[PDB]
Amino acid sequence: MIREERLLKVLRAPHVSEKASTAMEKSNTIVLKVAKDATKAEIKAAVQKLFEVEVEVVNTLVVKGKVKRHGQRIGRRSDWKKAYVTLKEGQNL
Amino acid sequence: AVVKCKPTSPGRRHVVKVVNPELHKGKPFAPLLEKNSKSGGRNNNGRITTRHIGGGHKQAYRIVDFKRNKDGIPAVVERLEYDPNRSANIALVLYKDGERRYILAPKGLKAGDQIQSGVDAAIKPGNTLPMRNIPVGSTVHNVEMKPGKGGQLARSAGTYVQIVARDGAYVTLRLRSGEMRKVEADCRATLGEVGNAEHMLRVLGKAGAARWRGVRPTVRGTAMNPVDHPHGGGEGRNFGKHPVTPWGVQTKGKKTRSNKRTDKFIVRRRS
Amino acid sequence: MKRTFQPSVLKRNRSHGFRARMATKNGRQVLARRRAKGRARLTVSK
RNA sequence: AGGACCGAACCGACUAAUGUUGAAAAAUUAGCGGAUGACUUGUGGCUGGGGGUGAAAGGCCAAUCAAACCGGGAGAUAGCU
RNA sequence: GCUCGCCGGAAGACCAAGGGUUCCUGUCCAACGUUAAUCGGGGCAGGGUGAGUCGACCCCUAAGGCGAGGCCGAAAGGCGUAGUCGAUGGGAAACAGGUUAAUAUUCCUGUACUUGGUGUUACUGCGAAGGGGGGACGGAGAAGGCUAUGUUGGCCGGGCGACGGUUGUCCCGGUUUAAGCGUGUAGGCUGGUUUUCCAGGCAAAUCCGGAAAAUCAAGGCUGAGGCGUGAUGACGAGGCACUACGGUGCUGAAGCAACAAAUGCCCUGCUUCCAGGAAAAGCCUCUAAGCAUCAGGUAACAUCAAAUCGUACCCCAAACCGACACAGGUGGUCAGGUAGAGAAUACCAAGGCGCUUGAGAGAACUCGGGUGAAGGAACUAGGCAAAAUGGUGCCGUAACUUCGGGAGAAGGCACGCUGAUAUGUAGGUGAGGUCCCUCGCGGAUGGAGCUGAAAUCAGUCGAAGAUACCAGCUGGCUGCAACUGUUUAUUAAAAACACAGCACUGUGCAAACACGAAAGUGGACGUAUACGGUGUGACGCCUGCCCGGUGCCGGAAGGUUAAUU
Ligand SMILES: [Mg+2]
Ligand SMILES: [Mg+2]
Ligand SMILES: [Mg+2]
Ligand SMILES: [Mg+2]
Ligand SMILES: [Mg+2]
Ligand SMILES: [Mg+2]
Ligand SMILES: [Mg+2]
Ligand SMILES: [Mg+2]
Ligand SMILES: [Mg+2]
Ligand SMILES: [Mg+2]
Ligand SMILES: [Mg+2]
Ligand SMILES: [Mg+2]
Ligand SMILES: [Mg+2]
Ligand SMILES: [Mg+2]
Ligand SMILES: [Mg+2]
Ligand SMILES: [Mg+2]
Ligand SMILES: [Mg+2]
Ligand SMILES: [Mg+2]
Ligand SMILES: [Mg+2]
Ligand SMILES: [Mg+2]
Ligand SMILES: [Mg+2]
Ligand SMILES: [Mg+2]
Ligand SMILES: [Mg+2]
Ligand SMILES: [Mg+2]
Ligand SMILES: [Mg+2]
Ligand SMILES: [Mg+2]
Ligand SMILES: [Mg+2]
Ligand SMILES: [Mg+2]
Ligand SMILES: [Mg+2]
Ligand SMILES: [Mg+2]
Ligand SMILES: [Mg+2]
Ligand SMILES: [Mg+2]
Ligand SMILES: [Mg+2]
Ligand SMILES: [Mg+2]
Ligand SMILES: [Mg+2]
Ligand SMILES: [Mg+2]
Ligand SMILES: [Mg+2]
Ligand SMILES: [Mg+2]
Ligand SMILES: [Mg+2]
Ligand SMILES: [Mg+2]
Ligand SMILES: [Mg+2]
Ligand SMILES: [Mg+2]
Ligand SMILES: [Mg+2]
Ligand SMILES: [Mg+2]
Ligand SMILES: [Mg+2]
Ligand SMILES: [Mg+2]
Ligand SMILES: [Mg+2]
Ligand SMILES: [Mg+2]
Ligand SMILES: [Mg+2]
Ligand SMILES: [Mg+2]
Ligand SMILES: [Mg+2]
Ligand SMILES: [Mg+2]
Ligand SMILES: [Mg+2]
Ligand SMILES: [Mg+2]
Ligand SMILES: [Mg+2]
Ligand SMILES: [Mg+2]
Ligand SMILES: [Mg+2]
Ligand SMILES: [Mg+2]
Ligand SMILES: [Mg+2]
Ligand SMILES: [Mg+2]
Ligand SMILES: [Mg+2]
Ligand SMILES: [Mg+2]
Ligand SMILES: [Mg+2]
Ligand SMILES: [Mg+2]
Ligand SMILES: [Mg+2]
Ligand SMILES: [Mg+2]
Ligand SMILES: [Mg+2]
Ligand SMILES: [Mg+2]
Ligand SMILES: [Mg+2]
Ligand SMILES: [Mg+2]
Ligand SMILES: [Mg+2]
Ligand SMILES: [Mg+2]
Ligand SMILES: [Mg+2]
Ligand SMILES: [Mg+2]
Ligand SMILES: [Mg+2]
Ligand SMILES: [Mg+2]
Ligand SMILES: [Mg+2]
Ligand SMILES: [Mg+2]
Ligand SMILES: [Mg+2]
Ligand SMILES: [Mg+2]
Ligand SMILES: [Mg+2]
Ligand SMILES: [Mg+2]
Ligand SMILES: [Mg+2]
Ligand SMILES: [Mg+2]
Ligand SMILES: [Mg+2]
Ligand SMILES: [Mg+2]
Ligand SMILES: [Mg+2]
Ligand SMILES: [Mg+2]
Ligand SMILES: [Mg+2]
Ligand SMILES: [Mg+2]
Ligand SMILES: [Mg+2]
Ligand SMILES: [Mg+2]
Hints:
- The PDB classes it as ribosome.
- Keywords: rRNA modifications, translation, ribosome.
- The entry is titled "Structure of the Bacterial Ribosome with hypoxia-induced rRNA modifications".
- Chain A is Large ribosomal subunit protein uL23.
- The organism of A is Escherichia coli BW25113.
- By secondary structure, chain A is of the alpha+beta class.
- Chain A has a single domain (about 1-95), classed as RRM (RNA recognition motif) domain (Alpha-Beta Plaits), CATH 3.30.70.330.
- Chain A has helices at about 5-10, 20-25, 40-50, and strands at about 10-15, 30-35, 55-65, 65-70, 75, 80-85.
- Chain A has a four-stranded antiparallel sheet with strand order 1-2-6-3. Chain A has a two-stranded antiparallel sheet with strand order 4-5.
- Chain A starts with a helix and ends in a 6-residue tail after the last strand.
- By secondary structure, chain B is mainly beta.
- Helices cover about 0% and strands about 25% of the residues of chain B.
- Chain B is globular and about 70 Å long.
- Chain B starts with a strand and ends with a strand.
- Chain C is elongated.
- Chain C is about 55% helix and about 0% strand.
- Chain C has three helices and no strands.
- Chain C has a single domain, classed as Helix Hairpins, CATH 1.10.287.
- The chains hardly touch.
- One magnesium ion binds near residues 51, 52 and 218 of chain B.
- One magnesium ion (MG) binds near residues 51, 52 and 218 of chain B.
- The structure holds two RNA strands.
């Protein structure tokens, strides 16, 4: 039982890329940017609550920020978490 | 027994090994083993406090019963065994009550013999008695010095102690070193010499043989520089000094015992 | 040939890390000196 | 069986030539020694400076050692340049 | 794109450590790249790392660290008990195929497995901070049984050849399939089974250890591989159609046998030696307190859960350690063909490269090599360097010797190819068939097929048959050190150091000695056949005289002599 504020915080944005598009067409999987401390169970519960779909499994990876130089000054982007969410082959969000 | 190797190599030319066919060839008794890792001569400060120690073969400690205080229950010798931790052989004995113990093997003790400790034990090798019950003139080993503490004198291969006099609460022993010592008659002693008396006839034959036993090379003092040893320095082979230890104490004849606490028990020094 | 710096993160941490510094008063004095100087990196941990 | 023998990996470093503002602040090339052992190696640990460790050369202790390095006494002192 | 060359026990592939975006795509060439650059590990933007089973985390410990109280110390602190950390070690479980530009044992397909929680059903003595077993352990050697793998044959598909020949004993290619599940084989170990009793395992125990009978004599444990299934599946040469020249879609033959064979597996096994070869938990089992027709235990079934972190890329290197895109260093794993003893070496496969300045010329001189008339150490400090020797089998081999050696002493002979012995022998393997029954992963016979030395005889070619690569120079006298080792990282490898052996000496255990204001620790869980120090340095024959000097040991009658009074 994960409370509604937690569920409303964990999801951040959908991830837009060609690998994501291919996954969504081919394996019924959406790719999301989630909260850095979100767990698989929380992502599953949040997806089901706020998209009223069904989920069988979640796969998570943490992306590491890219070190970038901006006008001769070292700067590092933030690490974020990415989730691969599989839907139960009838949902089609 | 004592057998010379054949000179098939320079390292084997001079090796003499002592081989006992009667030693158990299998693994030791698992319930009576601990672990004892090596020190390297280093103390809890991490400093070398004894030199020429290091390396060697891994060993496991066999709990030997030096107290021999299971009185009245006879035991039978199961097998002689090789102990890497001492120069003597240990015999595994089995008590009538189903308990097994390691004891130092006396001379002539073979598998199947009966041993027993206590004041009522018979006068035969392997039997531990109080020294007031042991007759005067007997040859003992594994002697105690404080009653109930455990045997401490004459534990090495071939060693033993003579009982030369019993006057009062004290018995006079002729220690292996030649020193005559007094000890309380209540302390225990096992009858007979320690076995493996041929242990001193072995010849290591090569430097690696001594390295196997954890002994490291000894550098002569006269081969060093003066900053390292009192004997150091010289152009060519020079000595011109009185021999001393690496810490300046004269090392040929200067006595170092100072124990007024135990001076009273020494009837006569070893000479 | 074999140079003197053979990197190893575990040994680096166990020898010059924040907790190894804080384990002793001399280490804490090291940390105090570095804080007073204003070092942006107190220890090797970061 | 063997601190046995010949010989790769591996560990070493006897000779010669090259290089010597080097390809390299110690190497390359051709030969050379050991190669089941007192062998070699990975990982971790311990020993701290008049101290360690040293099969001992005053060797080694981070390219530094007849007393490491860093900071301080300190602008030591310098009848010398 | 086509040729050419190089590595192939690596200069190929995969990890660990270390690095951190270098990975992939688009774009740009100012600076960086020792030149140009359209290129790049460069700049800029975007993308990319998916796990119940891999690793960490986690449970458990080693060395060692920290350490409540404690002991000790001017202070700071030092040591350490109970504890608690600490892998480089022990502990549950997944494979094959497919797919991206970049991830995959992580995604998809197929087929599995492990642990734990619940909830029903049946039966039921459960219970530990305690007992026992187990985990759980060396070096060397040898052999048998296998597999990975390779070769050939069969089979299938294709081919009939740029120049003489090539429908054949001809050429090219393919001939693959896992974990799991079932079976239990080569081998290894072990006598079982049931009663009774017990000074042991801190108490208890039905568990372990011990004792005594009875009975049966075969039961158990472990175990590679093979076989069956997984799998009518997948993969598959190739063929057909395409975008669009990257690659997509469809279909898909054969998919067997023999032989050889590991350094891999059975095997933590076996034999043997002495230098005598971790710990703790998980696991199995026994009970105590306690609970007691409850809990809890076992079994079956259903259901749920397995979180978090890493995952790109380099990794003998242009990405790590060397200031460099630096001829250096860097642990582990894999291990094809031909010849060979071989992981050497030569040529090759898979695979990867041509080393980020070139074009000419063809002087001296320098570097690295080839050959050299006659002579052959005359060179030189010195045969430094070079040249030479170099394999296998057989014959043969001196002084001396510690009887092992010296010794590969020295020296010599044979060596290719073809045929026959023998259309391929001795040997190895071993089908069908038949027989036997304990009927099967069985035993006997049998020899098809496959593989296959070595030798002799005869012939034959060349200047030369160990033809390349590869691969001891030998002997004599002598000093030193016995020997194998070690050493001045970076001018000294030796005759120096060590050494086994010898001797002197200290040390009676709370040992001497050493580190330490101390507590403590090492010596040593050792006990005079032991330990420390010193000198000498295998072995053989030996080791002579001097105690005056200095040192040490012993003595204590006398002289002198501190604090103190
Ligand atoms: Mg999944
Ligand atoms: Mg144990
Ligand atoms: Mg010593
Ligand atoms: Mg010695
Ligand atoms: Mg010297
Ligand atoms: Mg010293
Ligand atoms: Mg001196
Ligand atoms: Mg002289
Ligand atoms: Mg003189
Ligand atoms: Mg050898
Ligand atoms: Mg040799
Ligand atoms: Mg190496
Ligand atoms: Mg040199
Ligand atoms: Mg070389
Ligand atoms: Mg070599
Ligand atoms: Mg050799
Ligand atoms: Mg200082
Ligand atoms: Mg000198
Ligand atoms: Mg430095
Ligand atoms: Mg240095
Ligand atoms: Mg000084
Ligand atoms: Mg001053
Ligand atoms: Mg100063
Ligand atoms: Mg000044
Ligand atoms: Mg002056
Ligand atoms: Mg090309
Ligand atoms: Mg080639
Ligand atoms: Mg890393
Ligand atoms: Mg970058
Ligand atoms: Mg790239
Ligand atoms: Mg690009
Ligand atoms: Mg340029
Ligand atoms: Mg330009
Ligand atoms: Mg780039
Ligand atoms: Mg993950
Ligand atoms: Mg695992
Ligand atoms: Mg500990
Ligand atoms: Mg402590
Ligand atoms: Mg305290
Ligand atoms: Mg722990
Ligand atoms: Mg580990
Ligand atoms: Mg593990
Ligand atoms: Mg990749
Ligand atoms: Mg236990
Ligand atoms: Mg182990
Ligand atoms: Mg063994
Ligand atoms: Mg072994
Ligand atoms: Mg096979
Ligand atoms: Mg196979
Ligand atoms: Mg055909
Ligand atoms: Mg033709
Ligand atoms: Mg063919
Ligand atoms: Mg199969
Ligand atoms: Mg029993
Ligand atoms: Mg081997
Ligand atoms: Mg990868
Ligand atoms: Mg590579
Ligand atoms: Mg370059
Ligand atoms: Mg390089
Ligand atoms: Mg090969
Ligand atoms: Mg050859
Ligand atoms: Mg090669
Ligand atoms: Mg190729
Ligand atoms: Mg020229
Ligand atoms: Mg020339
Ligand atoms: Mg020549
Ligand atoms: Mg000539
Ligand atoms: Mg000539
Ligand atoms: Mg001549
Ligand atoms: Mg001559
Ligand atoms: Mg001359
Ligand atoms: Mg001349
Ligand atoms: Mg001359
Ligand atoms: Mg020469
Ligand atoms: Mg030559
Ligand atoms: Mg020859
Ligand atoms: Mg000779
Ligand atoms: Mg010969
Ligand atoms: Mg035959
Ligand atoms: Mg075969
Ligand atoms: Mg002479
Ligand atoms: Mg001379
Ligand atoms: Mg020598
Ligand atoms: Mg040598
Ligand atoms: Mg060394
Ligand atoms: Mg060296
Ligand atoms: Mg040098
Ligand atoms: Mg003697
Ligand atoms: Mg003590
Ligand atoms: Mg000498
Ligand atoms: Mg005198
Ligand atoms: Mg005197």
